[PDB]
């Protein structure tokens, strides 16, 4: 009975360890632009200042 209880406790702690180590990898994971900056306006392409604009500026 006591070994079954400790099986539950030690597996709970290993669930805790493999929770947190994964969450640390979830921290340092490369974030997409949609999460990092504004969700809409998915491009970072500025295309700003459009009054005296010249055809051919995009590349």
């Amino acid at each position: 009975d006591i070994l079954n209880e400790e099986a539950k406790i030690v597996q709970a702690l290993n669930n805790q360890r493999e929770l947190t180590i994964k969450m640390h990898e979830l921290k340092r994971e490369e974030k997409d632009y949609a999460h990092s900056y504004s969700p809409l306006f998915s491009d970072p392409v500025p295309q700003g200042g459009s009054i005296g604009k010249a055809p051919g500026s995009s590349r």
Partner: peptide, 9 residues
């Protein structure tokens, strides 16, 4: 060596 049962036994 991951379950505590067999290790403690």
């Amino acid at each position: 060596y991951n379950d505590h049962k067999k290790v403690r036994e």
